[PDB]
A paper describes a structure:
AfuA is a class II/cluster D periplasmic binding protein with two globular α/β domains linked by a dual β-stranded hinge.
To structurally characterize the ligand of AfuA, a 1.6Å crystal structure of ligand-bound A. pleuropneumoniae AfuA purified from E. coli was solved by use of sulfur single wavelength anomalous diffraction. The mutations T150A and S37A lowered but did not eliminate binding to G6P, whereas mutations to the sugar-binding residues (H205A, D206A and E229A) completely abrogated the interaction. This indicates that the hydrogen-bonding capacity of the sugar-coordinating residues is the critical determinant in mediating binding of potential sugar phosphates. In AfuA, the essential residues His205 and Asp206 form multivalent hydrogen bonds to the sugar moiety of ligands and function as the primary determinants of ligand selectivity.
Residue numbers in the entry: -1 to 319
Write the structure that this text describes.
Amino acid sequence: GSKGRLVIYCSATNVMCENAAKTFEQKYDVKTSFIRNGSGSTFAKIEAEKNNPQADVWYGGTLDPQSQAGELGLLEAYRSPNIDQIMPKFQDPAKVKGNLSSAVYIGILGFAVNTERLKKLGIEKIPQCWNDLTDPKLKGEIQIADPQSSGTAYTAIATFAQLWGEDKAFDYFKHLHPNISQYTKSGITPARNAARGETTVGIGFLHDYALEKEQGAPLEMVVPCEGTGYELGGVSILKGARNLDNAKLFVDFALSKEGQETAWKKGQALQTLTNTTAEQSPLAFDLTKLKLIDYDFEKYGASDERKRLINKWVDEIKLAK
Ligand SMILES: O=P(O)(O)OC[C@H]1O[C@@H](O)[C@H](O)[C@@H](O)[C@@H]1O
Ligand SMILES: [Cl-]
Ligand SMILES: [Cl-]
């Protein structure tokens, strides 16, 4: 009873990806496989493969590189009927309109603190603001990912540019740098290392920290006092997808009540869902309760900002010097 196939480039966590693929395969009899890689890493792969695309759909990870892929003609437009159920402000959020990319979840940018480690290091108060993370007492005690690979890291750079302006954002990263022990390849690695007690502060998306906390890690999550940004998780069909009808079916599924709910019910992924008919995890953040910027996906999900800010970060924040 096999009904074709589907290849997914996934940029969410392995557990979320595997659950989505298995659930889709069992529901629709589509032989479904995925390859997981960072949001930025996946963008580069898709761009390199554009003359002979090797996947059908790009699922999860942050919207900005999917929006950039749309701008560059790497995607195939498709508006799912399930867009009707998506939070109106997020129905068609990318730079090029027409649902070349669609929003499947929301992740809040912030940081979390291993409180056992903070204590075991002699620091009395938990950082509450982005500003607090440049405190010299945190030298070598913070981790964040590298935006060459990680969507999360780019969401942070773009958030900081939107909060403070680009110049002061790069001032901030200059001051944050001495406190970073490791720039990680994956967005989620600071959460894992903070949970493990290998680092004291991780910067990333708070739902990853919430999952670690739910599993017993001594973490305190912080929505920084100045305000913060967020990812939209993206789903996009690749231009030249060999399995186009099945790709459209997967976009429908990813935007559906069932497909989104299964992320937190079975896929160990606690992002806030964009489908207004879906039940949220009790652990999901509620956007109406948070000090969030109006994150400009049209502006930051574009080559000018993504190439320019990432190359600027590489040049100044870690190379020289
Ligand atoms: O930063 P990246 O490696 O691109 O990954 C980004 C992804 O990271 C995960 O850990 C989060 O659960 C996802 O919500 C996010 O989309
Ligand atoms: Cl993973
Ligand atoms: Cl197909």
